[PDB]
Every structure is written in C-alpha cells, then in structure tokens.
Paper text:
The breakage-reunion domain contains the catalytic tyrosine responsible for the cleavage and religation of the DNA double helix.
TopBK was crystallized in presence of magnesium (crystal I) and calcium (crystal II) and the structures were solved at 2.1 Å and 1.95 Å resolution, respectively, with one monomer in the asymmetric unit in both cases. When magnesium is substituted in the crystallization conditions by calcium (TopBK crystal II), side chains of the triad are observed in an inactive conformation similar to the one observed for the low resolution M. tuberculosis Toprim domain structure. The structure displays a two-domain organization, a globular domain constituted by discontinuous segments (residues 448–564 and 633–654) and the Tail domain (residues 565–608) connected by a loop-helix-loop hinge region (residues 609–632). Surprisingly, the high resolution structures of TopBK, revealed two disordered regions, between β1 and β2 (residues 460–474) and between β2 and α2 (residues 484–492). These regions are structured in the context of the catalytic core or in presence of DNA. In the structures of type II topoisomerases in complex with DNA, this loop (hereafter named DBL for DNA-Binding Loop) constitutes the interface between the Toprim domain and DNA and is stabilized through protein-DNA interactions.
Residue numbers in the entry:
A (entry chain A), B (entry chain A): 448 to 464, 474 to 483, 492 to 654
The structure:
Amino acid sequence: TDPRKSELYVVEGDSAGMFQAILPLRGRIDRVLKNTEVQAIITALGTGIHDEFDIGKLRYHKIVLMADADVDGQHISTLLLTLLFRFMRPLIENGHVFLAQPPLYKLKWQRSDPEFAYSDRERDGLLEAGLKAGKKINKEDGIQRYKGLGEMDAKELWETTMDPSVRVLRQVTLDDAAAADELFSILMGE
Amino acid sequence: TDPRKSELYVVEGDSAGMFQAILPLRGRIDRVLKNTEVQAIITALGTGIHDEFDIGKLRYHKIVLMADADVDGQHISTLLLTLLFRFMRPLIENGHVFLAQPPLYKLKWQRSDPEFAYSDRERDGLLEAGLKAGKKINKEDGIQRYKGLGEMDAKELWETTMDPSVRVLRQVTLDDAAAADELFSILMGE
C-alpha cells in the first residue's frame, strides 16, 4: 500500500477493460481541469498542480497510461501527457510516467494456455515455437487480433498489462511528453 | 467504462493487495475530509458532498469496500461508512454500497486448481467434496488460513473478490451504516 509499492493505472477511454490503483479517463485546457475524472486522477496523485506541486506528496511510484492504439485512444493519452507536462512536469522528469503496451494478438493453443503477442514479430515467433513444440492451433480462428482493450476479459487484461513480471511498459521521457504537448496544441488549433 | 457498467473498489488498509476502478485507504471528522486518499475517493464518486450531493453525477454503479476482518480493517471500514452515512447518504439508501468478503482459506489441491473458502462451513464442504472426487491434499500445509489481504497474490485477490461470477458481496443497508456511525462516535469519545 506504501507509495514506493504503489502504482496508478489510468485506463482510457470509451473502449476500456504491489498495490495497483485504477482510474478511468473517457473520451479548453481550463475546462479539462474541471472534469471529474481528471480531478480524481490529479487528487489521487496527491502532489497538487503548477506552483503548488510537491514531489514529496506523490502517492504513486508509477503512473501507467493504458489506451487503444487507434486515434480515440491516442487523443486521451495526448490530453493526459499534456496536463502532466504543463502542471505536474517533475512526474515525467523523475521517470514516474509509463505507457502500457496492450497485447495485439491472442494465440488460442488447443490443449495449452493461450499466449499473447505484443508485435507481429512476436506473434510469428511464438506461432513457430509453439508448432515446433507440438502445440496445436486452428488456422482459421486460432489467432485473435485485438481491436481494443474492451475485447479482452478482465483476467487476461490484468495478466498481460498489469502483472509486473509479464507486462510491456514504455517510459515516458520529457521529449515524449513535449511531443504530446505539441500534438495537443496542433489539434486544438484545428 | 459507462457509470452503469462501472464499479469502484476501496481497498483498506495497511495490509492491502465491467470497469473496475481501485483506490486505497490506509489506516477529527473535518481532518479526515482533508486527507488526500479520502479526497480521491470522494472526487472519483463525482456526486459532491452534503447539500451539494447530486445522485445524477454518480460515476460508479457499485462502491465496494474491501478490508481485513481484524480491528485495523474494521476501523477503516467504520470510518468510510460513517463519511458515506453523514455526507453521501443516498449512496447507501439507493443500494450502491457493498462490503467484499475476502476468502478465509485456500485449499491447495495437489494436481488441480486451488479452491477458496469464505467460511469454516464452506472449507469443510469443499475439502470433503474434493477428497470424494479423488483430489489430493497435504494434511499438514494444504490448507492456508489467510491472516490478511496482503498474503494473497494479485491474481488470486481479483479471482476471489473482484470477479463478478465468483466474488462474495454483502449489501450495506442504512441500518448497517447507522451502526458503523455509532461505532465511530463511541471510538472517538474513547
């Protein structure tokens, strides 16, 4: 439960699923700060914002953003990384911010546990290794290509994106957050 | 992600682990409302408090409190049910508040999936049924008696307390919340 042993997952957006807290974010910067879901995330982090930001009050060692690979999922991650870059910058600078890579494929092996691939390369690798081991797979429907997080059952979502020994996390750098901030400014101007 | 398909789990306290949001609560009523963890829970619910309470702004269909059976776990559940009874009463009245019953025992069957018991009666029943079916168990260490939520691995905690088809939930009635409020007042006076 301790901040050092605590993580906060922010699950985005309209196609959604060590202490692991979880908060949603569904989907004008002043209007976004008034949004209830945004307010809950900011409050849970416990640092305060802008000039009131206090790193010592950080409630979570890791902040993990989880969204779909599509434009809808990108839009929400862009929004949250911009809010963090503009009002809670040391969270990014000190390496607390991460992006969860959801699995792209589920390999439905006939008489064994299903395997999950995070890229086309891993899918091909796992398929070859499985067939070589003697595992069986249906050529027509044995490989499920995920379209969103909502397609996964809650148990497999945890196994693939939240289990620390299995999950694929990418650290958000200051340059990554600056690129999200630029993207936000471009889209607002459009 | 929709409020109707959303649940908020409040995991208590110092011995801790359909969209399922999760928030911690570790462990003078005016001082409690200023606490960051309490503020995050209230904010996530989205209704506001006291005269500002708006049922229409409720972000979660179910509010589930999960704590250890000991005095430490009871103290936190007493505190949160009191806050809900005093400042967010319709959440209890409208049947949104529940208590999660964590498993008391894990039956470590030798060559099959482990089973979980929520009472001494269920433990005895499952043990008899398993041995009758031909399942094997070690008489010395095969039955683990849980002392707290922190003893469970994250995956089994979800399977037993968060899976809607498996979990054991008890609805918090207005009388239940009134008894928690009385208990809080007695302990504060002590």
